[PDB]
Structures are given as structure tokens and as C-alpha cells.
């Protein structure tokens, strides 16, 4: 009975073990725990995530540091034929002498595991080449990632202000950012690719010495400032290229010209840079949009206030959404999450069909364990986005200060909102599930005919108004000509956005009734997943069963029995409940690519065609076909190619399953036998007197809903991790 | 039995010589 944990207090002298766990998971909840003030808090998240940026560079440093002395590079930059790159040297005393067996991979000596992250085709794809020329990485990034900590402290020290009120501006910042940051953060990138990289790509080197002496041309920046730009884009690249070595190089930066190549897919050298340039005006033009003292531009209210488009004469206000998104800090961290969440997939779904790297897809592995660590996350976000926008409603938010006002009304007219959401799901439910059992009752029954199978019309449609110049077809006003564009033609859409059907890497894959289902079952995901998050959110406040559900809103998990019987009815435990469908959408979706891709590589595509229109088969060929390689990899006949992976894959099936305890156990049963099991010691010799300092207990009644999960998840997400890789690696495909 | 401030000493010392030479070796007899 002492005093400890240095921030909370109720937690601090709790005699059990809760003392510990609950210590290590209240840490990051600054707003309201002993040590806090609106001044403290803000800054106490500020020099926190200055502790951020900081940890991101000790990551990146070492990423560029298990590479430069081993882990082929003055190899893989001789020509990157699909044979096993490298990450770092695996070194475990447990290893058998089959240290010698693959695991130990060709070029390098001691065993290793190869880059499935992209880094290897972008440390390269912006030039960065020679193995005497290369060994920087940490050296900079780290002589950086320490500065990242210095402000941390410097701006934590009172004196040279850590700034307090200055944290609720906007206008000034974001009038600064989306110019100063992004814009010049582009630009400066547009800078780099162009002076030092494009030359490093098509053309030749750049020598650490000269930087003035090197001049993309003979007669300099020539006109350029002379408004005359155009004559960049003439004989820019070629195609009879031999990537990296000139000769059919040509030298005129910028273009939109040429296009695809069996020797590298990937966006053209230049274009990723006029772009990076091109956008860098708009944000700079955008930055400079709001006040910042001098007396031009805008006040961020007064263009909300009575702005409003369909308001005006429809009795529906707009009061200080500013001093509630601003006085909120959660609204903040949740319009932040999403955007990021929506774009984390826009990143990672555009990062294929348009990968911008020297040898990538036509790699087809790194390409498929990189769409998903950007599909997991991304899904994993969204949830948290939806989860800090049901905290705003409880800790912050202010009915008297927001009312008639359009954030309310959203609350007020809520019972509908979840219903016209739930109506989507239940429809999108049984109607996908009619079509998939029916599709599976009919096979097995001997009749492959009778199969219900809708072409994805409005899909392929989008594309026969693009470039999918598949087997003709007019369309009234289009025909395939007469009218083409007329207004457009040999500018813009040249060879590009002209991949067509290209059975290899056409960008757009040619869609049929197999895709008119998954595509309606990713749709039944974010809908159901959100009826629960929308709901979860749309009353962390309270409701009929629990009316006054607040002052703590979020994680109060549980309530007494009686009333109807009341349970996981905290906006957390709906978040808790949400994360299962974000782990089921972000599964149907990823599942889908790959089966597709797999088949669309070292083989067919008919495969996904008549064998994704049903369900059994999704299990049989895929799931059951294409595991093969891995599992007979521990084999009764010695450790073959992969062994990390399949052991991971069963580590995968355990961490998972062992979720369930936590999940079908519920503190009551556990605590009680610990009541009997802590009559032991006390009553047994050679283990008496011997005192605990924390009183043996069973896990909190919210805690285990988490831990089963944060357990359910790794197992699950560590299984596909090991699954896809352990099968997109032989393949075949 | 001079325990008068120690243990930090025996956890760099002892445990840098159950692991310094303990891992290293002059000619493998490998993993």
C-alpha cells in the first residue's frame, strides 16, 4: 500500500495488477488525466509527436543501412531480373545447418530475406546507384532524425516559447502549410527529380563533385523565363531506350509522350515532375487564401457563418463550426484521419496499374504485399477516424453552442440515419448471399448452366468511354468514330491511358460476373462497417436504454443486468465491434486482387472467370489451390525453400484462435478460480511469506474485448502476411 | 557480502561475459 504511477491517482494506489496494465494504456490519453491543462495538453501532444517525425527517421535510416555493404545493389542495378533482392541478414542461433539451404540466397553470403518493400525500386528509381557512390542514408536522415528531437526539447523549454494559445489559429497555419509545406515540398521535389535523377535515369551520372558543371543541356536554362516552355516536349525520350543508358535517350526534360514498355512498366521519367511542378503553383496559389495579419484574403468564419448554399431560406443554421472544430481537437484528429483514410487507398489502389517504379509489377510480389499494407492501415484508419468523431460528441461538443446548427440536426434527425444505412446492408446482405449459394447449389448439383451471373455492365461501361477499345461497339455518339473527341486528339491521351485489354498489365482488367459480386460484397462492407461506426458515433451521447450515457462517454464498457439487459453499448464497444468488419471488408477487397493478378500472371484468367462466380471454389482453387508451396515446406522431408512463412502462418492460426478466450470468457469465471488459485501459495510451503506487490486479478471488463482483438488481429493480419508472400513467390500465378 | 551498493556491476560484468565471448567464435561451427 504505497504510491506510484506518475500521472493518474485512482490508478496509482490500486493494490491489484490493474495497477500495471491500465498504467500502460492511459499514458497517451492526455486530455483529462491528473497532469493536464488546455495549455499542457496541446503542447503535451506537440513535443509528443516531435517525438514523432523523430522515430520515422531511425526507421528509414536503417532501411537504407541494411543495404550498402551487402544486400545486393551493385548487383540489382546491373539488371533486376525477378530473382530475390535483399533486406538484411537473418542471424538466429536456433537455425540448423540448412543455413546453407536457400535462406542464403545466391549473390550474398550468410542468409537473408529480400526487399518486399518498394524502397529498392525508388532508392534506385530516383537515380541513387553506385556501390562506391552509395553508402549515405542514415548519415543524412539521421543527422536529420536527431534535429527532430531537438525542437522536441527546445520547444518544450518554457522561455523560448513552447506557445500556448497560438495553437488554435488556422488561417495563419494552413494559410502557411498548403503553400510553405506541400507546395514548396513539391516544387523542391520537382527540383530534385529534374536536376539530379532524370539525368540519372535515361541519361548518365552526376558526379558528387559537379553540380554547376552538369547542365541538362549545352546552353542552360536557355529561354524558360522567356515564356517559351513548349520546346521541352520534343524528342524527349524514345523507346529503343535501354533504361539508364542514353542511346535512344535524347535529352529534353518533360513530356506526356511515348508510354508503356516491356522494358519497365512505370510512369515515364519526366511526367511525375511537370506534375510535381504543375501542382506546385495551385497550392502556392492556394496558400495565400486566408488572413495572416497584413490585411488581404479571408477570415475562416464569415464564409461559413451565413455562407451556406442550400441554406438561405430552409430554416437550418450554421453557427461557429469553427470554434467547435477548433475548440474540439477530436473533430481535428478525425477529419485528419480519413482524407488520410480515403487517400491511403487512393495511394495504394493507384500505386498499381500506375506504379511509378523501375521494375515493379512484372515483379508481381512486392507489388502484392504493398497494395495491402495500405489497405490494412487505410481500413485500420477510417475506423479511428470514425472513432475520434464519437469522442468529440462526449468529451468535447456542446448542444447549447452548436444548435439549430447543422452539426446538430445531424444528431437530432439520427434515428433515420441508421436505418437508411441498415436498409442498405440487409438488402446488400441477402441479395449478395442469394447470388453465391444459388451459384454454389447449381454447381455440385451438376448444372453449371442455371448459374445466376450478372455482367458488370456499369463497370466495363466506364472504360468503353476511355480506352477499352475491346472488340469494337459504337455507343450512340461515339461509335468508335465519326465523332471521336474532335475537341481532343493528338495532345494529352497519346499512347497513355491507352493500355486497352493488354493481357499482362493493361491497367484495367476486363471485368465479368465474378467481379459483379465481390464488388457488391466490398459494398456490403463499408455500409455495415459504418452503420455500426455511424451508430457507434451517433450516440456515444445516450439513448432510451442508456439515456444519460455520458461525462465519460467512450469506454465505459458494460452495465448492470436488468433494464433489458445491457452490454457492449459504449461507443468504444461499437468501435470494438466495428473493427471486425474493417477486418472483413479489408479482406474481401484484398483477397480479391490476388486471384486476379495471381492467375493474370504466370498463366490464365479464365480461372477467376467461371470460378469466382461462386463460393466453394473461392475456398477450393485459391485458399486450397495456392498454399501448396508453403506447407509442405516444413515437410516430413527436411526444411525446404520457405520456413519462416508457414510457421508464421500457424503462428497466424494460433494468435487468432487464442483471441476467443478473451471474447467468450468474460472476467467473472477467471477471477473466481484465481480466488481459489490464490489460496495456494498462502497455504503451501516453500512459497509462503513470499509476497506479491500486485493483487492477483482477472482482466478488466473492457480490457479483454480489446486484447481478444489486438490478438484476433495480428493472428489474422499476420496470416495473410505470411499467406500471400508464401505463395506469390514460387507461384506460379 | 559487500553488497553495499552493487548488482549494477554484476549485470554489465557477468552479463557481458555470458554473451561477449559467448557469442563470437573464431571459426564458426556455425548455426
Amino acid at each position: 500500500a504505497l504510491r506510484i504511477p506518475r500521472f493518474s491517482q485512482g490508478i496509482a494506489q490500486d493494490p491489484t495488477t490493474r495497477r500495471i496494465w491500465f498504467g500502460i494504456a492511459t499514458a497517451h490519453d492526455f486530455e483529462s488525466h491528473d497532469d493536464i491543462t488546455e495549455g499542457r495538453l496541446y503542447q503535451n501532444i506537440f513535443a509528443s509527436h516531435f517525438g514523432q517525425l523523430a522515430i520515422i527517421f531511425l526507421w528509414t535510416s536503417g532501411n537504407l543501412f541494411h543495404v550498402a555493404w551487402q544486400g545486393n545493389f551493385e548487383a540489382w542495378v546491373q539488371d533486376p531480373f525477378h530473382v530475390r533482392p535483399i533486406a538484411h541478414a537473418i542471424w538466429d542461433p536456433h537455425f540448423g545447418q540448412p543455413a546453407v539451404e536457400a535462406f542464403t540466397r545466391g549473390g550474398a553470403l550468410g542468409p537473408v530475406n529480400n526487399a518486399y518493400s518498394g524502397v529498392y525500386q525508388w532508392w534506385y528509381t530516383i537515380g541513387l546507384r553506385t556501390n562506391e557512390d552509395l553508402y549515405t542514408g542514415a548519415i543524412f536522415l539521421l543527422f536529420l532524425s536527431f534535429i527532430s528531437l531537438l525542437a522536441g526539447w527546445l520547444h518544450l523549454q518554457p522561455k523560448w516559447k513552447p506557445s500556448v494559445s497560438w495553437f488554435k489559429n488556422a488561417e495563419s497555419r494552413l494559410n502557411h502549410h498548403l503553400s510553405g509545406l506541400f507546395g514548396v515540398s513539391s516544387l523542391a521535389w520537382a527540383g530534385h527529380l529534374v536536376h539530379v535523377a532524370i539525368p540519372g535515369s535515361r541519361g548518365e551520372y552526376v558526379r558528387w563533385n559537379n553540380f554547376l558543371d552538369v547542365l541538362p543541356y549545352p546552353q542552360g536554362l536557355g529561354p524558360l523565363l522567356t515564356g517559351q516552355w513548349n520546346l521541352y516536349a520534343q524528342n524527349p525520350s524514345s523507346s529503343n531506350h535501354l533504361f539508364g543508358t542514353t542511346q535512344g535517350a535524347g535529352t529534353a526534360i518533360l513530356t506526356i509522350l511515348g508510354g508503356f514498355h516491356p522494358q519497365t512498366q512505370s510512369l515515364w521519367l519526366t511526367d511525375v515532375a511537370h506534375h510535381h511542378l504543375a501542382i506546385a503553383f495551385l497550392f502556392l496559389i492556394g496558400g495565400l487564401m486566408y488572413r495572416t495579419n497584413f490585411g488581404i484574403g479571408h477570415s475562416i468564419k464569415y464564409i461559413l457563418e451565413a455562407h451556406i448554399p442550400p441554406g438561405g431560406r430552409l430554416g437550418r443554421g450554421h453557427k461557429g463550426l469553427y470554434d467547435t472544430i477548433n475548440n474540439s481537437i477530436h473533430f481535428q484528429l478525425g477529419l485528419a484521419l480519413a482524407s488520410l483514410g480515403v487517400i491511403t487507398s487512393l495511394v495504394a489502389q493507384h500505386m498499381y496499374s500506375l506504379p511509378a517504379y523501375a521494375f515493379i509489377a512484372q515483379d508481381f510480389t512486392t507489388q502484392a504485399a504493398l497494395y495491402t499494407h495500405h489497405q490494412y492501415i487505410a481500413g485500420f484508419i477510417m475506423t479511428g477516424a470514425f472513432a475520434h468523431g464519437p469522442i468529440f460528441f462526449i468529451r468535447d461538443y456542446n448542444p447549447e453552442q452548436n444548435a439549430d446548427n447543422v452539426l446538430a440536426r445531424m444528431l437530432e434527425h439520427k434515428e433515420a440515419i441508421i436505418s437508411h444505412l441498415s436498409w442498405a446492408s440487409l438488402f446488400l446482405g441477402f441479395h449478395t448471399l442469394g447470388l453465391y449459394v444459388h451459384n454454389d447449389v447449381m454447381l455440385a448439383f451438376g448444372t453449371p448452366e442455371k448459374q445466376i451471373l450478372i455482367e458488370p455492365i456499369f463497370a466495363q461501361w466506364i472504360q468503353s468511354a476511355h480506352g477499352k477499345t475491346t472488340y469494337g461497339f459504337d455507343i450512340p455518339l461515339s461509335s468508335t468514330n465519326g465523332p471521336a473527341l474532335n475537341a481532343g486528339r493528338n495532345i494529352w491521351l497519346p499512347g497513355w491511358l491507352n493500355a486497352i485489354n493488354e493481357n499482362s498489365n493493361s491497367l484495367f482488367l476486363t471485368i465479368g460476373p465474378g467481379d459483379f459480386l465481390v464488388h457488391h460484397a466490398i459494398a456490403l462492407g463499408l455500409h455495415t462497417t459504418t452503420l455500426i461506426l455511424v451508430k457507434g458515433a451517433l450516440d456515444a451521447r445516450g439513448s432510451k436504454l442508456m439515456p444519460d450515457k455520458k461525462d465519460f462517454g467512450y469506454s465505459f464498457p458494460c452495465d448492470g443486468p436488468g433494464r433489458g439487459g445491457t452490454c457492449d453499448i459504449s461507443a468504444w464497444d461499437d468501435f470494438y465491434l466495428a473493427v471486425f468488419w474493417m477486418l472483413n471488408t479489408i479482406g474481401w477487397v484484398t483477397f480479391y486482387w490476388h486471384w486476379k493478378h495471381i492467375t493474370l500472371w504466370r498463366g490464365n484468367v479464365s480461372q477467376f472467370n467461371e470460378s469466382s462466380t461462386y463460393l466453394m471454389g473461392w475456398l477450393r482453387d485459391y485458399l486450397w489451390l495456392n498454399s501448396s508451396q508453403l506447407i509442405n515446406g516444413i515437410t516430413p522431408l527436411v526444411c525446404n525453400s520457405l520456413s519462416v512463412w508457414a510457421w508464421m502462418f500457424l503462428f497466424g492460426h494460433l494468435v487468432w484462435a487464442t483471441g476467443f478466450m478473451f471474447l467468450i470468457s468474460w472476467r467473472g469465471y477467471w477471477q473466481e478460480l484465481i480466488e481459489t488459485l490464490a489460496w495456494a501459495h498462502e497455504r503451501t510451503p516453500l512459497a509462503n511469506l513470499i509476497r506479491w506487490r500486485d493483487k492477483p486479478v482477472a482482466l478488466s471488463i473492457v480490457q479483454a474485448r480489446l486484447v481478444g482483438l489486438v490478438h484476433f488481429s495480428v493472428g489474422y493480419i499476420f496470416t495473410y502476411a505470411a499467406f500471400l508472400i508464401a505463395s506469390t513467390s514460387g507461384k506460379f500465378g | 557480502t559487500k553488497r553495499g551498493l552493487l548488482l549494477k556491476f554484476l549485470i554489465l560484468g557477468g552479463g557481458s561475459l555470458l554473451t561477449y565471448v559467448s557469442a563470437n567464435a573464431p571459426q564458426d561451427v556455425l548455426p
Partner: peptide, 30 residues
Amino acid sequence: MINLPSLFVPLVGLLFPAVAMASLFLHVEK
């Protein structure tokens, strides 16, 4: 001397842990 770079898995994966599982038993006491 020949072939000897094996100390940054115990100092980390082994000895660094010793430190903190010891040390951080500061959560109990110090």
C-alpha cells in the same frame, strides 16, 4: 582475425531486455 560480427543481437534482443525487465521493475518499485 576472421568472421566475428555477433554482438548486436544479445546486447539488444537479449541484454537490452535484461536491463529493462530489471530496471523497469521500477513500475513495481525503484
